[PDB]
Design a binder for these strands. Structure first.
Ligand SMILES: Nc1ncnc2c1ncn2[C@@H]1O[C@H](COP(=O)(O)OP(=O)(O)O)[C@@H](O)[C@H]1O
Ligand SMILES: Nc1ncnc2c1ncn2[C@@H]1O[C@H](COP(=O)(O)OP(=O)(O)O)[C@@H](O)[C@H]1O
Ligand SMILES: Nc1ncnc2c1ncn2[C@@H]1O[C@H](COP(=O)(O)OP(=O)(O)O)[C@@H](O)[C@H]1O
Ligand code: ALF
Ligand code: ALF
Ligand code: ALF
Ligand SMILES: [Mg+2]
Ligand SMILES: [Mg+2]
Ligand SMILES: [Mg+2]
Ligand SMILES: [Zn+2]
Ligand SMILES: [Zn+2]
Ligand SMILES: [Zn+2]
Ligand SMILES: [Zn+2]
Lengths: 367, 343, 334, 360, 364
DNA sequence: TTTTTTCGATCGTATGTTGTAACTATCTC
DNA sequence: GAGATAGTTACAACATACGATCG
């Protein structure tokens, strides 16, 4: 019913995935009692800037006291969770970018908080404010009243004036890795009582880059496609990703310089109807991974372990020059793909070109 | 109309007071000094009322006309000051000024400030109406050649001793900005009551605040001074000048040089200069340029300039300044291996 | 807006559909300049806005005909660039779209004519899509362009295409000889330079462009032997630079074809110049110069605010450099 | 009055759409399971049915009977949505409403409850044309909309949208329709319209469609208009300028032999006859690809081409594959730059002249 | 609570100000000799002490003992000025109040004599944000100023003001605080606060401050929070690494010395935060071009790259020009081919590998 | 004795002029 | 002394000029 992204917003510092340094710094500051009056949060999309800001607000305004572990059960915590807390003024800077709104906001900063011990202004998308709006906040931000705190969040910090940056403590959130995303997805699905498979979760984690919101959106889409289940076949169909085995077999056939096998593989792919641009992209990715393995033994990731040994074999046999030649040929073929009579025709011509200029076994020369 | 320089303005004022004074130039310091001298003399003569207005499209000329027409019970001998736009007066401003000059009274003293007027601006009804009863003071910032003499004289009139090195440092740091230089001299006098200004003393309380124009950069390129050209380019970038203006200013001289180099194979340079309407003073520098750049050069420069223009126009790139620096080094005798020229 | 004879058939087809009610609400006419597509569109608009049509032609006496003659018909809209500008902005498209919503003043059909769809900016083209897909009842759109491939694919997919084929070469030559007096070779060369479209050759002859072409030919004849291609600057630096660059490219192509051996050449009135070009230049240099000329012409026609003199000077110096031995020549690439 | 085939035959039910099986299955499963998201984005090529599917989803959401994947099509809400005059379905043309002021005004009214339907649906078309400020203003409300509003977005250039917007919505990609599907749809439409047709004309129209059904319908309408109300093979061939005879084979043979005079004569004859140059280039590219394919394996030659086998095999045996690749590259380059040349014939001549130089 | 270091350590005396001798000495001499101008302007970078010096001057002007450069700090006027309750000192935030109507009421108070001070001081800060009408009103007020009023102006963009305003006030330009003075101030503050610290941490913080004392204090507060009440070398180094955003220069340095492991580590670190790969390539190309220009002439490098001046100079001095040209060409080809690569990260990695180990073959 | 610039589309701030609504003072019964 | 009319003040809308950012 409820969207996973909205349902599973962290409500305690223990629920946050990663961002260890920021959480440790905030906890130490709250425990020691050294609390600033201007915090800036930076990072890529969907990493938890707003979540951490709301958790900090809960910690500041909790009824028990200023603590790094909010209870989560008192009236203030519940109201902050529901977004109905009077003393947490949340401003959408993307919508109110005019200096008149900023002046109206600043004209009422000296009034005491209604119920809480602090008045917390959480300005989101602050990078969209106008220059006059930025310059109007300098003095108030530098020397706010005792009972006023400012929290700022943005994804484009470099657009802020240096004067604004000099007045606040900066925390840069980092993109999450595959392991953390996969673990979070496993936990969420287990709590939701939904069947899943390890390979599907690995594919979803790799396809989400380093954003948890993207991972949750992809999980919802897969659940919808899979009809209440997350299956490897359903996720593979949704993402339009072909089996690495077929791409590796095609690369090996191209290297061996046997046209019959390449044509048979192309016919087999056409029987299913494999997307051809995706096939070229997969082959380019495999060649790039082989080159990286040649550069450094540890370049190869864990997700390719199922074929890792095979990859290593190529890294031990193919000279780097041949790898570069194949990569360049496939890149040019992709570049010229749109103007070919047909995508299948273009891919076949690219493969024939690669075979013709094979470093070791070119096609026979006519008499 | 009388023509004068700032030094003779006080002598003219002592001689007598005219009806209208025109202060035209690009130097704020000299304009301010002339305005202050004129207003002090007028106040001595009995002008205790002053009004100032800014000329712009959204201007209330009715108030000015009412001020000119109306009398005063006790506070007579009014003074009016106008500030012309940076671009200069237009047809509407021309007719407004003509109307204002029509309503002129002996008890009203008019002062006008603005940039130097061109021939088209000069040939105006209002300008000619004041010809018989006006004095124009020309306030132009001295060039680098005459700057050290001005600095030495200004220091002398303040009862200060400047060494040659200190004078050179002051000229280098505050070139084209006389207001900053005068304020620096005042601050130095405040710092050292004895008035002894040595090189180490001045070097401590001086900052780089020079002002330049694209013509200075082009002249530096023609002379062949890499350091000066780079400094001018950096100052222009800091100011926020439009790259296209620099591109056009360089293009004119570069095309002229290319044509002269091509056609100088079988023709004396003097005839070419006469035919191309080259100013006499510049003919020197241009000459040495033709003795420093070969035909192989002036083609790579043109190619780089065209590439920079294309990048600025269609690609909307941000690396225009780097290409400008590369071209500046190219015009000076440097290797410039041509990997950056894409040649 | 002359009505050429060869427009008689096509019109008789299009209007016929409008008589049967089987008319597409968006018609895109593909025709070379000087083919008279504007006259055809005007005739169709006059037919559509006539309150009492008779046969395939407007009555000429009803109120609609009088308003069209006076040029103050409320229900007739034209989208053209401003006098000082060169492109059609999005504000005009938005205003026309908002005005189309309300009912017609005369209670009839509404006609909108786009003078040239190739001049539309990206924003205007995107804004026009929604209106063009599902226009209100009794609304007709007419668009004209030279190369449909230059238009936006989404915009193109919403229109019905009609192509005007130039008449046969002999008929065009006879018509031109009837219109103007000139030698047969000159008429044939002018016709071929205009891609076989009559009227464009008439435009070349009626103006002073022929003298400019002769001056360019003389300058090139002087430059080719000596090798001083910079002197051509004066013959090329003009507001009509693209046409002269096209003429130069045509001369180079004719010289290259003559070198390869061919019976037909675009420039039939100047055998000597093409012969000299073929004799004094190698095929590779000719191809490189032709490619550079075409690229510079495209840049001049495409980029906005580009400086003409700098580009032409750079092109001439580059050609002179290419003429030197041992210089690597450009190769076409994606 | 009269409506073209594209407007008349807009699908009104999930079963009336062609292809896009995965999107329909996902939407049906989501509606049945009760898992309904608040932000849907549709991406794909032109004329694939993004707006049609968006309208079908909007109709299904607000149907009086309930939230179902099979709208009745007879209740008041369905009829009003079909007619495009439903109060609670607000359709925005982002191509003409790019101003941030319009976006702010739209967002200021989200607090009002829906008039009649159970949801207030916003259908933003051409959303890629919005300004940056509009996207940033949308972000906050798009993340956490009220419980009674839904957002449907359709675009053809998803790359231009910021990643923040893409992260907040479920994305559905629509594949380009296959030739067989387009041909079947055209045949069904013509049969329903009682219009005579031939299989080859339908095949040619489907091939020229290039994966877009709107383009196929436009071409069919043009053919009907220009063919006295009948679709025939000759009419479609004339409209599309099909090469028919083996002019391309002779031209490529002349090019390979490096005989400039023959190539120029053939080009002049083609220009006199007035053929389409793009079709000629495509046919030459296809012939070169077939020749390259035959060299790898003799059996690769198609059986449908059992009229020029001798010449094709002679070319395959006589020409090394590298020269074939060079010619293919040259023809591709010529095809790319054809619309930018002063004339189509001039561009074709330039391409052929460049190709003639690849001979010792 | 403990307050904030920036707010707690406001300079309350001329002796507490760090550096800026060329301004403080001139002000003290002017006050001693009675040579006081009508309008003062202060310019400089962020967090250099413009407002602090303006407040100190205002306090010195209106002290009970007299006009002196060393305010007593004990009389009622000094305490009121320190607490911000002095009646005759009017502080105007021009950024918040820009319209002419707001400025007119404030400027109309010059017609009233001072209540309990020798001078009526107006301290207008962020004055560059005023509108044209506000500037005209200010100029009209400054044309005929009463003898018992003084104007103090502070801004970071003096070029925005009209020349007429500039010509009627004396301007003082403040300089950067330099590394040594910042380090000494930080050490003094920490010693006063009873906070453990190490020399290396202080040096790193001072170097990262980049000429601003407020930045140094903010970084010190953040480090104290991270270190749990202590300043240590490891904690400060980790904190700076978290905020480090100069991967381009590090990548160039690693590539030039053929160190693949460092290149891969830098790529991973860059990917950890949200960065645009094409932007990274553009930055690397710009750095290489700047190095080439510096090799051509030492004057190419200006004051805009003072932070990384030493590294750029070392790279220019060490690397031969041919290697720089080769790397520049390789990166140009990489940028050209980036759109068609399987992924942006993969494209960048391939280009860096080619620069590290491979050399293109040119025609002929 | 002069030589000074790319264009389109979108967003934000400040000032001047004209029109409408609400409240108060004045006029008439 | 009350109701009606005329005059004054405050707020909103429209039009013009100037400055800044991104493609
Ligand atoms: N560190 C994290 N731990 C747990 N969930 C997270 C984290 N970061 C993001 N999420 C998930 O992503 C969703 C959106 O995060 P959001 O608050 O938008 O972050 P940002 O403000 O950086 O975009 C949340 O509902 C949350 O479930
Ligand atoms: N999947 C489909 N099934 C049936 N008809 C379609 C389909 N896609 C497109 N069409 C036809 O194309 C026309 C335009 O489609 P449209 O809704 O504009 O798609 P898009 O929004 O992708 O351009 C419709 O009138 C319809 O007849
Ligand atoms: N020269 C200095 N000496 C001592 N502290 C300084 C100095 N400059 C700045 N600071 C510190 O920086 C903080 C902010 O300075 P601020 O008054 O904002 O300068 P600015 O007005 O230039 O931004 C002050 O609290 C002060 O402690
Ligand atoms: F809500 Al975000 F990046 F999408 F902070
Ligand atoms: F291609 Al469309 F609406 F016409 F997406
Ligand atoms: F207050 Al400041 F520079 F930030 F003077
Ligand atoms: Mg957020
Ligand atoms: Mg659509
Ligand atoms: Mg300050
Ligand atoms: Zn609590
Ligand atoms: Zn009629
Ligand atoms: Zn229904
Ligand atoms: Zn005191």
């Amino acid at each position: 019913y409820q969207v996973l992204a909205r349902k599973w917003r962290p409500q305690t510092f223990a629920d946050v995935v990663g961002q260890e340094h920021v959480l440790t710094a905030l906890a130490n500051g709250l425990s020691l009692g050294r609390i600033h009056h201007a915090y800036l949060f930076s990072g890529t999309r969907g990493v938890g800037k707003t979540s951490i800001a709301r958790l900090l607000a809960k910690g500041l305004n909790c009824e028990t006291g200023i603590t790094a572990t909010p209870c989560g059960v008192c009236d203030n915590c519940r109201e902050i969770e529901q977004g109905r807390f009077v003393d947490l003024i949340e401003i959408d800077a993307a919508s109110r970018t005019k200096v008149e709104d900023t002046r109206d906001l600043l004209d009422n900063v000296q009034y005491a908080p209604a119920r809480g011990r602090f008045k917390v202004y959480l300005i989101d998308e602050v990078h969209m404010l106008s220059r006059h709006s930025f310059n109007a906040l300098l003095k108030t931000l530098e020397e706010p009243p005792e009972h006023v705190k400012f929290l700022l969040a943005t994804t484009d910090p470099q657009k802020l004036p240096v004067t604004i940056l000099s007045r606040c403590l900066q925390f840069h959130l980092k993109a999450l890795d595959v392991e953390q995303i996969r673990h979070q997805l496993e936990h969420i699905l287990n709590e939701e009582h939904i069947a899943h498979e390890p390979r599907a979760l690995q594919l979803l984690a790799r396809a989400a880059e380093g954003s948890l919101r993207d991972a949750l959106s992809l999980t919802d889409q897969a659940i919808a496609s899979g009809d209440g289940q997350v299956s490897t076949q359903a996720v593979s169909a949704m993402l339009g990703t072909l089996d690495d085995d077929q791409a590796l077999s095609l690369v090996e056939a191209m290297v061996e310089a046997n046209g019959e096998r390449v044509m048979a593989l192309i016919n087999e792919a056409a029987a299913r109807g494999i997307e051809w641009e995706a096939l070229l992209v997969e082959m380019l990715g495999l060649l790039h991974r082989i080159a990286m393995v040649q550069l450094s033994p540890a370049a190869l990731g864990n997700d390719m372990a199922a074929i890792e040994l095979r990859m290593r074999e190529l890294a031990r046999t193919i000279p780097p020059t041949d790898i570069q030649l194949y990569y360049q040929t496939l890149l040019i073929g992709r570049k010229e793909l749109p103007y070919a009579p047909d995508r299948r025709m273009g891919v076949e011509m690219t493969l024939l070109r690669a075979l013709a200029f094979h470093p070791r076994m070119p096609l026979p020369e006519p008499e | 109309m009388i023509r004068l320089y700032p030094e003779q303005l006080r002598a003219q004022l002592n001689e007598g007071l005219r009806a209208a004074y025109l202060l035209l130039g690009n130097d704020p310091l000299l304009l301010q000094e002339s305005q202050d001298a004129v207003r002090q003399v007028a106040a001595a003569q009995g002008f205790e009322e002053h009004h100032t207005f800014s000329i712009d499209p959204n201007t209330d000329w009715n108030a000015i006309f009412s001020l000119c027409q109306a009398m005063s019970l006790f506070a007579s001998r009014q003074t009016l000051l106008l500030l012309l736009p940076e671009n200069g007066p237009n047809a509407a401003i021309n007719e407004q000024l003509l109307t204002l000059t029509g309503l002129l009274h002996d008890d009203l003293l008019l002062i006008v400030r603005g940039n130097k007027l061109s021939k088209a601006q000069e040939n105006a009804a209002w300008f000619t109406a004041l010809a018989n009863r006006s004095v124009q003071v020309t306030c132009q910032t001295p060039e680098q050649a005459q700057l050290p003499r001005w600095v030495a004289a200004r220091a002398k009139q303040l009862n200060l001793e400047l060494d040659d090195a200190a004078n050179q440092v002051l000229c280098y740091c505050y070139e084209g900005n006389l207001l900053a230089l005068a304020q620096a001299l005042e601050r130095l006098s405040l710092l050292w009551p004895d008035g002894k200004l040595t090189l180490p003393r001045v070097e401590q309380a001086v900052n780089d605040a020079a002002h330049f124009t694209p013509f200075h950069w082009v002249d530096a390129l023609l002379m062949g001074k890499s350091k000066r050209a780079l400094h001018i380019l950096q100052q222009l970038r800091l100011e926020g000048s439009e790259p296209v203006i620099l591109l056009r200013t360089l293009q004119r001289e570069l095309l002229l040089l290319v044509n002269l180099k091509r056609q100088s194979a079988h023709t004396p340079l003097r005839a070419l200069f006469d035919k191309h309407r080259v100013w006499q003073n510049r003919r020197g520098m241009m000459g040495e340029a033709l003795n420093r750049l070969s035909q192989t050069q002036l083609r790579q420069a043109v190619q780089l300039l065209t590439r920079t223009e294309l990048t600025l126009k269609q690609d909307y790139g941000q690396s225009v300044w780097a290409e400008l620096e590369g071209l500046s080094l190219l015009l000076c005798h440097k290797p410039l291996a041509d990997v950056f020229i894409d040649g | 807006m002359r009505w050429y004879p060869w427009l008689r058939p096509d019109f008789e087809k299009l209007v016929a559909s409008y008589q049967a009610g089987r008319g597409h609400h968006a018609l895109l006419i593909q025709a070379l300049p000087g083919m008279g597509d504007d006259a055809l569109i005007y005739a169709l608009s006059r037919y559509l806005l006539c309150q009492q049509p008779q046969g395939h032609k407007s009555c000429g006496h009803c109120r609609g005909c009088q308003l069209m003659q006076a040029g103050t018909h409320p229900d007739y809209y034209t989208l053209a660039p401003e006098k000082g500008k060169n492109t059609l902005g999005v504000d005009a498209v938005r205003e026309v779209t908002e005005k189309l919503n309300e009912h017609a003043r005369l209670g009839g059909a509404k006609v909108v004519w786009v003078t040239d769809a190739a001049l539309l900016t990206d924003a205007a083209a995107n804004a026009l899509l929604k209106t063009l897909e599902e226009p209100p009842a009794e609304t007709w759109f007419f668009l004209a362009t030279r190369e449909p491939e230059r238009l936006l694919a989404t915009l193109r997919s919403r229109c019905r295409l009609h192509y005007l084929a130039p008449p046969p070469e002999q008929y065009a030559v006879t018509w031109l000889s009837r219109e103007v007096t000139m030698s047969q070779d000159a008429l044939l060369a002018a016709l071929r330079l205009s891609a076989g479209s009559p009227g464009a050759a008439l435009a070349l002859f009626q103006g002073d462009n022929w003298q400019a072409r002769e001056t360019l030919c003389q300058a090139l004849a002087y430059s080719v032997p000596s090798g001083d291609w910079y002197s051509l600057l004066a013959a090329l630096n003009h507001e009509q630079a693209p046409a002269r660059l096209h003429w130069l490219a045509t001369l180079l192509m004719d010289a290259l074809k003559r070198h390869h051996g061919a019976a037909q050449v675009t420039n039939v009135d100047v055998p000597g110049l093409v012969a000299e070009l073929a004799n004094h230049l190698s095929p590779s240099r000719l191809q490189a110069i032709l490619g550079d000329v075409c690229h510079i012409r495209e840049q001049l026609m495409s980029v906005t605010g580009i400086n003409r003199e700098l580009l032409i000077t750079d092109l001439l110096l580059r050609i002179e450099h290419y003429l030197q031995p041992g210089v690597v020549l450009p190769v076409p690439h994606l």
